[PDB]
Design a protein around this ligand. Structure first.
Ligand SMILES: Cc1cc2nc3c(=O)[nH]c(=O)nc-3n(C[C@H](O)[C@H](O)[C@H](O)COP(=O)(O)O)c2cc1C
Ligand SMILES: Cc1cc2nc3c(=O)[nH]c(=O)nc-3n(C[C@H](O)[C@H](O)[C@H](O)COP(=O)(O)O)c2cc1C
Ligand SMILES: Oc1ccccc1I
Ligand SMILES: Oc1ccccc1I
Lengths: 200, 200
């Protein structure tokens, strides 16, 4: 069954101002590595996660699980293992505990029917990446900051968060208010000519 | 060098209302497959693409190229090849020509220094996926619709858009106004319990 698209549309003059304003808003987003431990309602994080989940996906499978962690002992154990692994191979990661939430994104390679059998999901890495994009935009929209982080150590995260075999950690995202006078590196984003090619 | 983070922050009551409102906005987004050929200023698409490019990336490499195509003969040739390939293995794809723009996202596996040598990029599939997420959010923000589409035929796209070896097509995104009375399938997104797990 099909239903008519319910979408607001605008004149070109309004799309110009909205697209320009949104670009400027998003350009202020920076990865932050120093957090305040100021409390945030769980309802804010739920809104953000379910926004990420509105992302398109291959064959509408939504092949993702978002694990939200605010429990301080699980955060401490994840920090310990993260630090240990990065040492062996800065490796100081207090943000894994100071941030009030960790969002751990898992990808689902297949689904398991209630009858044991498996069904492949489609374009999973792309789909889940897109959803992480929506996650980060929603975080920014809410007035929070985040640290996009490698999902490591991968096996430890899978075990302590008790996720099944059809899933694997994809990204790790501390979220919170920034620390007062948090600093970021003075980076410059690529200009239009270095990222964009236009045919006519 | 480092510089202080310049970010607006809000009280919990305001983050609640903003995160809730943004969720509702984003939940209206739907993949649309029937476009109007109403004209859109190139400046809108540029704003959208450069918004996508504000995405975080592994080691700040921004390992992506956005190819914007409005040229009707290139669009016709891409349509022809897309349709041909999907036939052999609906396969009617008029959107590839009716949409005023196609954005073709390429991922960069490595960079090529001006001196011939190569340097690996890091977490490319994740980084580019995130950027595609920002792309789609910016499209929605502007009041447009899009069709997130497999990058196929992969080789044809690489050739007709003349991209170098360190790059590969990642996603194909028609963008425009929706057709009047465009229809979407009557799908339901997963509920919180099917996508989200909370520890304390
Ligand atoms: C897939 C991915 C993985 C990342 N992993 C880490 C990480 O492990 N540690 C870290 O400090 N930053 C990590 N980052 C953040 C980048 O270093 C950061 O995005 C980049 O320096 C650009 O800064 P910006 O996001 O403020 O523009 C990651 C980013 C992405 C997209
Ligand atoms: C990685 C990816 C690839 C997709 N490829 C196609 C495609 O090739 N053809 C198509 O008609 N839709 C494609 N889609 C769109 C999905 O079918 C659509 O997102 C899904 O049915 C959910 O609909 P919604 O985005 O309106 O929520 C793709 C989506 C993603 C994320
Ligand atoms: O999501 C999709 C819809 C139609 C054909 C392929 C995919 I993946
Ligand atoms: O982007 C990064 C920053 C620090 C360490 C690894 C990555 I990938």
């Amino acid at each position: 069954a099909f239903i008519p698209y319910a979408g607001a549309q605008f004149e070109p003059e309004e799309m110009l101002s909205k697209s320009a304003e949104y670009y400027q808003f998003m350009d202020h987003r920076r990865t932050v590595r120093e957090f305040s431990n100021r409390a945030i309602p769980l309802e804010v994080i739920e809104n953000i996660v379910m926004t990420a989940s509105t992302a398109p996906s291959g064959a509408h499978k939504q092949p993702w699980t978002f694990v939200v962690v605010s429990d301080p002992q699980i955060k401490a154990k994840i920090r310990q293992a993260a630090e240990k692994e990065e040492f062996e191979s800065d490796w100081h990661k207090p943000f894994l505990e100071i941030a009030p939430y960790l969002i751990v994104v898992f990808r689902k390679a297949y689904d398991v029917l209630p009858d044991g059998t498996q069904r492949k999901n489609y374009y999973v890495q792309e789909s889940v990446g897109i959803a992480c994009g929506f996650l980060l935009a929603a975080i920014h929209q809410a007035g929070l900051v985040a640290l996009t982080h490698t999902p490591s150590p991968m096996n430890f995260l899978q075990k302590i968060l008790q996720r099944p075999e059809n899933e694997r950690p994809f990204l790790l995202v501390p979220v919170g208010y920034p620390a007062e006078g948090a600093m970021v590196p003075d980076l410059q984003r690529k200009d239009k000519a270095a990222v964009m090619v236009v045919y006519h």
